[PDB]
Amino acid sequence: GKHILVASVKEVYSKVDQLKAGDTLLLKDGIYKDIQLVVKRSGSKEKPIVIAAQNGGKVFFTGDAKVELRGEYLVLKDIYFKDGNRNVNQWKSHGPGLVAIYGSYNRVTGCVFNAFDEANSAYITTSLTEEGKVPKHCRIDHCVFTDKITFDQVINLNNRPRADKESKVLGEAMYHRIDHCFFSNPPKPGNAGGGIRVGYYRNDIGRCLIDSNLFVRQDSEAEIVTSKSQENVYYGNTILNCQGTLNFRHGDKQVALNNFFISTDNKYGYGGMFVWGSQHIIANNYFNLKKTIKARGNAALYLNPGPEGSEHALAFNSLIVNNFFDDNNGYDINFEPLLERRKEFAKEVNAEFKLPYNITIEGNLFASKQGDKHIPFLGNLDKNNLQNNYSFGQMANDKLFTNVKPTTDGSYNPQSYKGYQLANVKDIKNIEGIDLDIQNLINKGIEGNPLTWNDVRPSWLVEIPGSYAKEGTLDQETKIRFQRVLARDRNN
Amino acid sequence: KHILVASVKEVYSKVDQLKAGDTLLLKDGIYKDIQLVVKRSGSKEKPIVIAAQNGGKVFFTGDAKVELRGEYLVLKDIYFKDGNRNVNQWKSHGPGLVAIYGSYNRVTGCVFNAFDEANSAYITTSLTEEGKVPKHCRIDHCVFTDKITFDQVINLNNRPRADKESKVLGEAMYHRIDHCFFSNPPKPGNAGGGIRVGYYRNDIGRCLIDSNLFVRQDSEAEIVTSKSQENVYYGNTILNCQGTLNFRHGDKQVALNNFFISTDNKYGYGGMFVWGSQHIIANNYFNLKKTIKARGNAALYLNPGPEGSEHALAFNSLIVNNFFDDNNGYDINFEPLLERRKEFAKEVNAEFKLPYNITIEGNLFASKQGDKHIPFLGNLDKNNLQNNYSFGQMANDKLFTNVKPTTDGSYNPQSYKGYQLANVKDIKNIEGIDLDIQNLINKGIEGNPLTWNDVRPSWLVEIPGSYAKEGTLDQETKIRFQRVLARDRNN
């Protein structure tokens, strides 16, 4: 359990290969330019190896830098990544991230990433070794990801090197946790990479927990999260003014519980969730979107039409309960987004086109100040199981709902409305390796409130870094570097 | 909303009814003699856009002009060629072909090729009749080629004319010129170069000129004539240009992370010429395979003369972290035009001085020419020569610490074993320019030269004309240029 103090890149290199379980390699204040930190030794579960700033906020990794956590039970802590300059020809989308986690049982905590450089990669990945071994049980927490001007997601959690859509072997469950992180990143063109990707296709098992994160103008592309694996849980996250949706994109049996999808202006279309596949639970989520996304279907919750189990898998046989759809400007639930394109897709792959069906809709509260201009649903409800739901405020198709009335001011909790009742659910399965009693959590309802910066920030960092969250634009130097990235892509 | 129009008359029928957030989309075609005067204004969040529906398919031709008089206006993806303005209605120092009278305006993606024979700039920021100065405008992703007329390509104005004796400062402009391409043929005399900012030492510019590509910008001796204080030239590439980027009038200017480069030794290339004080010349890479004989054969020229005058002494400035790589000439000339400046000093009854108090630190001086290469001309004793570095035999290199490369093809002195950046402190930022000047100095030469694909309008594949390509103008343009030159010689 020895603290080992170092003050330069060369002094780091001199110690890294001698670290033992319980050692903390403490970096003195300074700039560590072009640091290529490759940690191959391992800690133990009770005595991790920690590599940390002595004073968070005073240690910068800059220049042509990277981190590879290849041992197990390693912690990278309180590092600030900025003023980067990697060789853009040595990095690509779908490769390792600026910090790449190759070993299991590893943690990246309190680290800040702001407009790092022009090399396209994620900021953090879990990456397979060259022999194909999948890292498991890692944690990314209390990190800050802002002003990303490069392609690929902010974070990729991988269990294959590339998508393998036809494989009969399942991608191995990963059991990672991403929690208390902050995301705010500017729009990029096309399928440019979003906030988080988990796995690649329907035949991948995730079993990762994404909880307590704060996304504020996470605007990189259409997908805030592109969840592309089975059995992931999105719990207690706050999505504020985000131009995109949290998606169950590939993989059945995913869960979104007690999140907030909120907005404080009507300047851009905000989301929201877009759902493909079946056996999902969408429960206890609060939606208040003052403007929704026209290109997707102008809704808070979108349920995909298409062929079952396909690349655009039909949304069906799922549970939508105890959510609060509060004064959305758009449909609350759209059961026919992108209808014509999906019909064309089903024809392209020679598969039966279907509309969403057997989705149980119960215990939800719909409220509006917009009168009959607000239409809660688009699409075919009779193919689904519409049980008792509740509404406050006159809206179109009001007769579907039981009238209720608020008793408190400013409550996010439908249980504070007189007449409201929670859904009766039973036999809900917990997810292996995620220590959450899902049925009990469904039955508690919406007891939370939106996260703020102080709820997630690294303890040493006072203000949100960067410029997109604060100003809605980039600082001048970053704008110039971003224009270089975009021109190189257009001409690639 | 999007408003489609397909003729000059249809443009005039809509332009005075535009509202914030409207886009006036021009259908493909030739808009001859269009005099586009945009008086309405957009808002910060919702500009008014006038744009080609299809970039490269709309042409403004004939006796044309654009006046952007409202605010929060954008002129986008217009191609200016085949012009025919009345040559008696336009003069140097007047408005440009596109004249920006209002603040918060943008001209983007517009291409200008050998437009006509009327002497004017291609784009100006122009004062209104009553004297109001436009501020916070942007000219970006524009292409300026084959200019056969007098005056600069772009003028940024804060006065109708130089008011050299005034104590009221010319108002700060805060414009940005970025991702533009310049390639223009030689004109005789003081014919107007690429960009002019302001008119004299008592003008404040605070303009950002960044990420531009000058390839055979050969119009005259000055690629940029920077004639106002506190302008920043950041990350521009100057390639085979027969001229220099100048700090001509006005103290406290910055040249950061630029490339002054060459790919042949056919003509004298530049380079920077510096008048005045309190400048920062940092992180610039120079490789000039031939230098300009008439100016003093150097990469960087520091002006001698009286302080604060029409030929202001270069003094009390910082020259750090630059890479003077195999220049054919002096790396720094501290006595250019020596006898002419002594005669000027006597004509104005002001004390002649040589450059002094210039701190030269952290620069890398390299050469393949041996002792034939001399890095400095003039008086070093008057200046603050700190730790500098060198690679390759050259004259007087005992002044330098030897360093060695670790890779091939690097523009970055930090890749040389033994090299150290300058120790700088208390460098302040310039108001209204969102760049951390001290941090940028300390990061050094991390970039590489721009190429055409880094700056071009996304719709335009090839550089217009062949001046950059072959030093030639097309036949019609050569005939029109001869008319301009004959009219000038006889005026």
Coordinates of all heavy atoms in Angstrom, one line a residue, chain A residues 31 33-34 62-64 82-86 88 115-116 118 268 467 473-488 490-491, chain B residues 138 140-141 176 178-179 208 210-211 234-235 412 414 421 433-436 439-440 442-451 453-456 458, unseen atoms left out:
Chain A
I31 N 1.8 19.2 -16.6 CA 1.4 18.7 -17.9 C 2.2 17.5 -18.3 O 3.4 17.6 -18.2 CB 1.5 19.8 -19.0 CG1 0.6 21.0 -18.6 CG2 1.3 19.3 -20.4 CD1 1.0 22.3 -19.3
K33 N 2.8 15.6 -21.4 CA 2.6 15.7 -22.8 C 3.1 14.4 -23.5 O 4.2 13.9 -23.2 CB 3.3 16.9 -23.4 CG 2.8 17.2 -24.8 CD 3.2 18.5 -25.4 CE 2.6 18.7 -26.8 NZ 3.1 20.0 -27.4
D34 N 2.2 13.9 -24.4 CA 2.5 12.7 -25.2 C 2.7 11.5 -24.3 O 3.3 10.5 -24.7 CB 3.8 12.9 -26.1 CG 3.8 14.2 -26.9 OD1 2.8 14.6 -27.4 OD2 4.9 14.7 -27.1
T62 N -1.9 15.5 -22.3 CA -2.0 16.3 -23.4 C -1.2 15.7 -24.6 O -0.5 14.7 -24.4 CB -1.5 17.8 -23.1 OG1 -0.1 17.8 -23.0 CG2 -2.2 18.3 -21.9
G63 N -1.2 16.4 -25.7 CA -0.4 15.9 -26.8 C -0.8 14.5 -27.4 O -2.0 14.2 -27.4
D64 N 0.1 13.8 -27.9 CA -0.1 12.5 -28.5 C -0.1 11.5 -27.4 O 0.8 10.7 -27.2 CB 1.0 12.2 -29.5 CG 0.8 10.9 -30.3 OD1 -0.3 10.3 -30.2 OD2 1.7 10.6 -31.1
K82 N -7.0 17.2 -22.2 CA -7.3 18.3 -23.0 C -6.0 18.6 -23.9 O -5.0 18.0 -23.7 CB -7.6 19.6 -22.2 CG -6.4 20.1 -21.4 CD -6.8 21.4 -20.6
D83 N -6.1 19.5 -24.9 CA -4.9 20.0 -25.6 C -4.2 18.8 -26.2 O -3.0 18.6 -26.2 CB -4.0 20.8 -24.8 CG -4.5 22.2 -24.4 OD1 -5.4 22.7 -25.2 OD2 -4.1 22.7 -23.4
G84 N -5.1 17.9 -26.8 CA -4.5 16.7 -27.4 C -4.0 16.9 -28.8 O -4.3 17.9 -29.5
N85 N -3.3 16.0 -29.3 CA -2.6 16.0 -30.6 C -2.2 14.6 -31.1 O -1.1 14.5 -31.6 CB -1.4 17.0 -30.6 CG -0.8 17.2 -32.0 OD1 -1.5 17.3 -33.0 ND2 0.5 17.2 -32.0
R86 N -3.1 13.7 -31.1 CA -2.8 12.3 -31.6 C -2.7 12.4 -33.1 O -3.3 13.3 -33.8 CB -3.8 11.3 -31.2 CG -3.8 11.0 -29.7 CD -5.0 10.0 -29.3 NE -6.3 10.7 -29.5 CZ -7.4 10.1 -29.5 NH1 -7.5 8.8 -29.2 NH2 -8.5 10.9 -29.7
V88 N -3.8 11.7 -36.5 CA -5.1 11.3 -36.9 C -5.1 10.0 -37.8 O -6.1 9.3 -37.9 CB -5.8 12.5 -37.6 CG1 -5.9 13.8 -36.7 CG2 -5.1 12.8 -38.9
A115 N -12.9 18.4 -25.7 CA -12.4 18.7 -27.0 C -11.0 18.3 -27.3 O -10.2 19.1 -27.7 CB -12.6 20.3 -27.2
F116 N -10.7 17.0 -27.0 CA -9.4 16.6 -26.8 C -8.5 16.8 -28.1 O -7.5 17.5 -28.0 CB -9.3 15.1 -26.5 CG -7.9 14.7 -26.1 CD1 -7.2 15.1 -25.0 CD2 -7.1 13.8 -27.0 CE1 -5.9 14.8 -24.7 CE2 -5.8 13.4 -26.7 CZ -5.2 13.9 -25.5
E118 N -8.2 15.8 -32.8 CA -8.9 15.6 -34.1 C -8.8 14.1 -34.5 O -9.3 13.8 -35.6 CB -8.2 16.4 -35.1 CG -8.3 17.9 -34.9 CD -7.3 18.8 -35.8 OE1 -7.0 18.3 -36.9 OE2 -6.9 19.8 -35.3
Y268 N -35.0 23.4 -30.1 CA -34.7 22.3 -31.0 C -35.6 21.1 -30.6 O -36.1 21.0 -29.5 CB -33.3 21.9 -30.9 CG -32.3 23.0 -31.1 CD1 -31.6 23.5 -30.0 CD2 -32.1 23.6 -32.3 CE1 -30.8 24.6 -30.1 CE2 -31.2 24.7 -32.4 CZ -30.6 25.2 -31.3 OH -29.7 26.2 -31.4
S467 N -17.6 24.5 -23.7 CA -18.4 25.6 -24.2 C -19.8 25.2 -24.7 O -20.7 26.0 -24.7 CB -17.6 26.4 -25.3 OG -18.5 27.3 -25.9
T473 N -22.4 26.7 -28.2 CA -21.4 26.8 -29.3 C -20.0 26.4 -28.8 O -19.8 26.1 -27.6 CB -21.5 28.2 -29.9 OG1 -20.6 28.4 -31.0 CG2 -21.1 29.2 -28.9
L474 N -19.1 26.2 -29.8 CA -17.7 25.8 -29.4 C -16.8 27.0 -29.2 O -17.0 28.0 -29.9 CB -17.1 24.8 -30.4 CG -18.0 23.5 -30.5 CD1 -17.5 22.7 -31.7 CD2 -17.9 22.7 -29.2
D475 N -15.7 26.8 -28.5 CA -14.7 28.0 -28.4 C -14.0 28.0 -29.7 O -14.0 27.1 -30.5 CB -13.8 27.9 -27.2 CG -12.8 26.7 -27.3 OD1 -12.0 26.5 -28.2 OD2 -12.9 25.8 -26.4
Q476 N -13.3 29.2 -30.0 CA -12.8 29.4 -31.3 C -11.8 28.4 -31.8 O -11.9 27.9 -32.9 CB -12.2 30.8 -31.4 CG -11.8 31.2 -32.8 CD -12.9 31.3 -33.7 OE1 -13.2 30.4 -34.5 NE2 -13.6 32.4 -33.7
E477 N -10.8 28.0 -30.9 CA -9.8 27.0 -31.3 C -10.5 25.7 -31.7 O -10.2 25.1 -32.7 CB -8.8 26.9 -30.2 CG -7.7 25.8 -30.5 CD -6.8 25.5 -29.3 OE1 -6.9 26.2 -28.3 OE2 -6.0 24.6 -29.4
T478 N -11.4 25.3 -30.8 CA -12.1 24.0 -31.0 C -12.9 24.0 -32.3 O -12.9 23.0 -33.1 CB -13.0 23.7 -29.8 OG1 -12.1 23.5 -28.7 CG2 -13.8 22.4 -30.0
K479 N -13.5 25.2 -32.7 CA -14.3 25.3 -33.9 C -13.3 25.0 -35.1 O -13.7 24.4 -36.0 CB -14.9 26.7 -34.0 CG -16.1 27.0 -33.2 CD -16.8 28.2 -33.9 CE -18.1 28.7 -33.2 NZ -18.0 30.1 -33.0
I480 N -12.1 25.7 -35.0 CA -11.2 25.5 -36.1 C -10.7 24.0 -36.3 O -10.7 23.5 -37.4 CB -10.0 26.4 -36.0 CG1 -10.5 27.9 -36.1 CG2 -8.8 26.0 -36.9 CD1 -9.4 28.8 -35.6
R481 N -10.5 23.3 -35.1 CA -10.1 21.9 -35.2 C -11.2 21.1 -35.7 O -11.0 20.1 -36.5 CB -9.6 21.5 -33.7 CG -8.4 22.3 -33.3 CD -7.7 21.7 -32.1 NE -6.9 20.5 -32.5 CZ -6.4 19.6 -31.6 NH1 -6.6 19.9 -30.3 NH2 -5.7 18.6 -32.0
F482 N -12.5 21.4 -35.3 CA -13.6 20.7 -35.7 C -13.8 20.8 -37.2 O -14.1 19.8 -37.9 CB -14.9 21.2 -34.9 CG -16.2 20.4 -35.1 CD1 -16.2 19.0 -35.4 CD2 -17.4 21.0 -34.7 CE1 -17.4 18.3 -35.4 CE2 -18.6 20.3 -34.8 CZ -18.6 18.9 -35.1
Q483 N -13.6 22.0 -37.8 CA -13.7 22.1 -39.2 C -12.6 21.3 -39.9 O -13.0 20.7 -41.0 CB -13.6 23.7 -39.6 CG -14.6 24.6 -38.8 CD -14.4 26.1 -39.0 OE1 -13.7 26.8 -38.2 NE2 -15.1 26.7 -40.0
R484 N -11.4 21.1 -39.3 CA -10.5 20.1 -39.9 C -11.0 18.7 -39.9 O -10.8 18.0 -40.9 CB -9.1 20.2 -39.2 CG -8.1 21.3 -39.4 CD -7.7 21.4 -41.0 NE -6.4 20.8 -41.4 CZ -5.2 21.4 -41.3 NH1 -5.1 22.6 -40.7 NH2 -4.1 20.8 -41.7
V485 N -11.6 18.3 -38.8 CA -12.1 16.9 -38.8 C -13.2 16.7 -39.8 O -13.2 15.7 -40.5 CB -12.7 16.7 -37.3 CG1 -13.5 15.3 -37.3 CG2 -11.6 16.7 -36.3
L486 N -14.1 17.6 -39.9 CA -15.2 17.5 -40.9 C -14.7 17.5 -42.3 O -15.3 16.8 -43.1 CB -16.2 18.6 -40.6 CG -16.9 18.5 -39.2 CD1 -17.7 19.8 -39.0 CD2 -17.7 17.2 -39.1
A487 N -13.7 18.3 -42.6 CA -13.2 18.4 -44.0 C -12.5 17.1 -44.4 O -12.6 16.6 -45.5 CB -12.3 19.6 -44.2
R488 N -11.7 16.5 -43.4 CA -11.0 15.3 -43.7 C -12.0 14.2 -43.9 O -11.8 13.3 -44.8 CB -10.1 14.9 -42.5 CG -9.2 13.7 -42.7 CD -8.1 13.5 -41.6 NE -7.6 12.1 -41.5 CZ -7.9 11.2 -40.6 NH1 -8.7 11.5 -39.6 NH2 -7.4 10.0 -40.7
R490 N -15.2 14.5 -45.1 CA -15.9 14.8 -46.3 C -15.1 14.3 -47.5 O -15.6 13.7 -48.5 CB -16.3 16.2 -46.5 CG -17.4 16.8 -45.8 CD -17.9 18.2 -46.2 NE -16.9 19.3 -46.2 CZ -16.6 20.1 -45.2 NH1 -17.3 20.0 -44.0 NH2 -15.7 21.0 -45.2
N491 N -13.8 14.4 -47.4 CA -12.9 14.0 -48.5 C -12.3 12.6 -48.3 O -11.5 12.2 -49.2 CB -11.8 15.1 -48.6 CG -12.4 16.4 -49.2 OD1 -12.7 16.5 -50.4 ND2 -12.7 17.4 -48.4
Chain B
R138 N -18.5 37.9 -40.9 CA -17.6 36.7 -41.2 C -17.6 36.5 -42.7 O -18.7 36.6 -43.3 CB -18.2 35.4 -40.5 CG -17.4 34.2 -40.8 CD -17.8 33.0 -39.9 NE -17.0 31.8 -40.2 CZ -17.5 30.6 -40.1 NH1 -18.7 30.4 -39.7 NH2 -16.7 29.6 -40.5
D140 N -16.2 33.5 -45.1 CA -15.7 32.1 -44.9 C -16.0 31.2 -46.1 O -17.0 31.3 -46.8 CB -16.2 31.4 -43.6 CG -17.6 31.1 -43.6 OD1 -18.4 32.0 -43.3 OD2 -18.0 30.0 -44.1
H141 N -15.0 30.3 -46.3 CA -15.2 29.3 -47.4 C -15.5 30.0 -48.7 O -16.2 29.5 -49.6 CB -16.3 28.3 -47.0 CG -16.0 27.5 -45.9 ND1 -16.3 27.8 -44.6 CD2 -15.2 26.3 -45.8 CE1 -15.8 26.9 -43.7 NE2 -15.2 26.0 -44.4
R176 N -14.2 38.0 -38.8 CA -13.4 36.8 -39.0 C -13.4 36.5 -40.5 O -14.4 36.6 -41.2 CB -14.0 35.6 -38.3 CG -13.2 34.3 -38.4 CD -13.8 33.2 -37.6 NE -13.0 32.0 -37.8 CZ -13.5 30.7 -37.8 NH1 -14.8 30.5 -37.6 NH2 -12.7 29.7 -38.1
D178 N -12.1 33.3 -42.7 CA -11.5 32.0 -42.4 C -11.8 31.1 -43.6 O -12.8 31.2 -44.2 CB -12.0 31.4 -41.1 CG -13.5 31.1 -41.1 OD1 -14.3 32.1 -40.9 OD2 -13.9 29.9 -41.3
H179 N -11.0 30.0 -43.8 CA -11.2 29.0 -44.8 C -11.4 29.6 -46.1 O -12.2 29.1 -46.9 CB -12.3 28.1 -44.3 CG -12.0 27.4 -43.0 ND1 -12.4 27.9 -41.8 CD2 -11.3 26.3 -42.8 CE1 -11.9 27.1 -40.9 NE2 -11.3 26.1 -41.4
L208 N -9.9 38.4 -36.7 CA -9.3 37.1 -36.7 C -9.2 36.6 -38.2 O -10.3 36.4 -38.8 CB -10.1 36.1 -35.9 CG -9.6 34.6 -35.9 CD1 -8.1 34.6 -35.4 CD2 -10.4 33.7 -35.1
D210 N -7.9 33.5 -40.0 CA -7.5 32.2 -39.7 C -7.8 31.1 -40.7 O -8.8 31.2 -41.4 CB -8.1 31.7 -38.3 CG -9.5 31.3 -38.4 OD1 -10.4 32.2 -38.2 OD2 -9.9 30.2 -38.7
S211 N -7.0 30.1 -40.8 CA -7.3 28.9 -41.6 C -7.5 29.3 -43.1 O -8.3 28.6 -43.7 CB -8.5 28.2 -41.1 OG -8.5 28.0 -39.7
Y234 N -3.9 33.5 -37.5 CA -3.7 32.1 -36.9 C -3.9 31.0 -37.9 O -5.0 30.9 -38.5 CB -4.8 32.0 -35.8 CG -4.8 30.7 -35.1 CD1 -3.7 30.2 -34.4 CD2 -6.0 30.1 -34.9 CE1 -3.7 29.0 -33.7 CE2 -6.0 28.9 -34.1 CZ -4.9 28.3 -33.6 OH -5.0 27.1 -32.9
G235 N -2.9 30.1 -38.0 CA -3.1 28.9 -38.8 C -3.4 29.0 -40.3 O -4.2 28.2 -40.8
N412 N 7.5 20.2 -36.5 CA 7.4 20.5 -35.1 C 8.8 20.5 -34.5 O 9.3 19.4 -34.3 CB 6.5 19.5 -34.4 CG 6.3 19.8 -33.0 OD1 6.8 20.7 -32.4 ND2 5.4 19.1 -32.4
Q414 N 9.6 20.4 -31.5 CA 9.6 19.5 -30.3 C 10.0 18.1 -30.6 O 10.3 17.3 -29.7 CB 8.2 19.5 -29.5 CG 7.9 20.9 -29.1 CD 6.4 21.0 -28.6 OE1 6.1 20.4 -27.7 NE2 5.6 21.8 -29.3
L421 N 10.9 24.7 -25.9 CA 10.1 25.9 -26.2 C 10.5 27.1 -25.3 O 11.1 26.9 -24.3 CB 8.6 25.6 -25.8 CG 8.0 24.5 -26.8 CD1 6.8 23.8 -26.1 CD2 7.6 25.0 -28.2
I433 N -11.5 38.3 -29.2 CA -10.9 37.1 -29.9 C -10.8 36.0 -29.0 O -10.0 36.0 -28.0 CB -9.6 37.5 -30.6 CG1 -9.8 38.6 -31.6 CG2 -8.9 36.2 -31.3 CD1 -8.6 39.0 -32.4
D434 N -11.6 34.9 -29.2 CA -11.7 33.8 -28.2 C -10.6 32.8 -28.4 O -10.8 31.6 -28.6 CB -13.1 33.2 -28.4 CG -13.4 32.1 -27.5 OD1 -12.9 32.1 -26.3 OD2 -14.0 31.1 -27.9
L435 N -9.3 33.2 -28.2 CA -8.1 32.4 -28.3 C -7.3 32.6 -27.0 O -7.1 33.8 -26.7 CB -7.3 32.6 -29.6 CG -8.0 32.3 -30.9 CD1 -7.1 32.8 -32.0 CD2 -8.3 30.9 -31.1
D436 N -6.8 31.6 -26.4 CA -5.9 31.6 -25.2 C -4.5 31.8 -25.8 O -3.9 30.8 -26.1 CB -6.1 30.4 -24.4 CG -5.3 30.4 -23.2 OD1 -4.3 31.1 -23.0 OD2 -5.6 29.7 -22.3
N439 N -1.6 29.9 -24.0 CA -1.6 28.5 -24.2 C -1.2 28.0 -25.6 O -0.5 27.0 -25.7 CB -3.0 27.9 -23.8 CG -2.9 26.4 -23.4 OD1 -2.1 26.0 -22.5 ND2 -3.8 25.6 -24.0
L440 N -1.7 28.8 -26.6 CA -1.4 28.4 -27.9 C 0.1 28.5 -28.2 O 0.7 27.6 -28.8 CB -2.2 29.3 -28.9 CG -3.7 28.8 -29.0 CD1 -4.5 29.8 -29.7 CD2 -3.8 27.4 -29.6
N442 N 2.5 28.1 -26.0 CA 3.1 27.0 -25.3 C 2.9 25.6 -25.9 O 3.7 24.7 -25.6 CB 2.6 27.0 -23.8 CG 3.2 28.2 -23.0 OD1 4.3 28.7 -23.4 ND2 2.5 28.6 -22.0
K443 N 1.9 25.4 -26.7 CA 1.7 24.2 -27.4 C 2.6 24.0 -28.6 O 2.9 22.9 -29.0 CB 0.2 24.0 -27.7 CG -0.7 23.9 -26.5 CD -2.1 23.2 -26.6 CE -2.9 24.0 -27.6 NZ -4.2 23.3 -27.8
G444 N 3.1 25.1 -29.2 CA 4.1 25.0 -30.3 C 3.5 24.7 -31.6 O 2.3 24.8 -31.8
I445 N 4.3 24.2 -32.5 CA 3.9 23.9 -33.9 C 3.3 22.5 -34.0 O 4.0 21.5 -34.4 CB 5.1 24.1 -34.9 CG1 5.7 25.5 -34.7 CG2 4.6 23.9 -36.3 CD1 6.8 25.8 -35.6
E446 N 2.0 22.4 -33.7 CA 1.4 21.1 -33.7 C 0.6 20.8 -35.0 O 0.1 19.7 -35.2 CB 0.4 21.0 -32.5 CG 1.0 20.9 -31.2 CD 0.0 20.7 -30.0 OE1 -1.2 21.1 -30.2 OE2 0.5 20.3 -28.9
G447 N 0.5 21.8 -35.9 CA -0.3 21.6 -37.1 C 0.5 21.2 -38.3 O 1.6 20.9 -38.3
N448 N -0.3 21.2 -39.5 CA 0.4 21.0 -40.7 C -0.2 21.9 -41.8 O -1.4 22.4 -41.5 CB 0.3 19.5 -41.2 CG -1.0 19.0 -41.1 OD1 -1.8 19.3 -42.0 ND2 -1.3 18.0 -40.2
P449 N 0.4 22.1 -42.9 CA -0.2 23.0 -43.9 C -1.6 22.6 -44.4 O -1.9 21.4 -44.5 CB 0.8 23.0 -45.0 CG 2.1 22.6 -44.4 CD 1.7 21.6 -43.4
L450 N -2.4 23.6 -44.6 CA -3.7 23.4 -45.3 C -3.6 23.0 -46.7 O -2.6 23.4 -47.4 CB -4.5 24.7 -45.2 CG -4.9 25.1 -43.8 CD1 -5.3 26.6 -43.9 CD2 -6.1 24.3 -43.3
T451 N -4.5 22.2 -47.2 CA -4.7 21.9 -48.6 C -6.0 22.5 -49.1 O -6.8 22.9 -48.3 CB -4.6 20.4 -48.9 OG1 -5.8 19.8 -48.4 CG2 -3.4 19.8 -48.1
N453 N -8.7 20.9 -50.2 CA -9.8 20.3 -49.6 C -10.1 20.7 -48.2 O -11.3 20.5 -47.7 CB -9.6 18.7 -49.7 CG -9.8 18.2 -51.1 OD1 -10.5 18.7 -52.0 ND2 -9.1 17.1 -51.4
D454 N -9.2 21.3 -47.5 CA -9.4 21.8 -46.1 C -10.2 23.1 -46.1 O -10.7 23.5 -45.1 CB -8.1 22.0 -45.4 CG -7.3 20.7 -45.2 OD1 -8.0 19.7 -44.8 OD2 -6.1 20.7 -45.3
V455 N -10.2 23.8 -47.2 CA -10.9 25.2 -47.2 C -12.0 25.3 -48.2 O -12.8 26.2 -48.0 CB -9.8 26.3 -47.4 CG1 -8.7 26.2 -46.4 CG2 -9.2 26.2 -48.9
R456 N -12.1 24.5 -49.2 CA -13.0 24.7 -50.3 C -14.5 24.7 -49.9 O -14.8 23.9 -49.0 CB -12.7 23.7 -51.5 CG -13.1 22.3 -51.1 CD -12.7 21.4 -52.3 NE -13.0 20.0 -51.9 CZ -14.2 19.4 -52.1 NH1 -15.1 20.1 -52.6 NH2 -14.4 18.2 -51.7
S458 N -18.0 23.1 -50.0 CA -18.2 21.7 -50.2 C -18.7 21.3 -51.6 O -18.4 20.3 -52.1 CB -19.2 21.1 -49.2 OG -20.4 21.9 -49.3

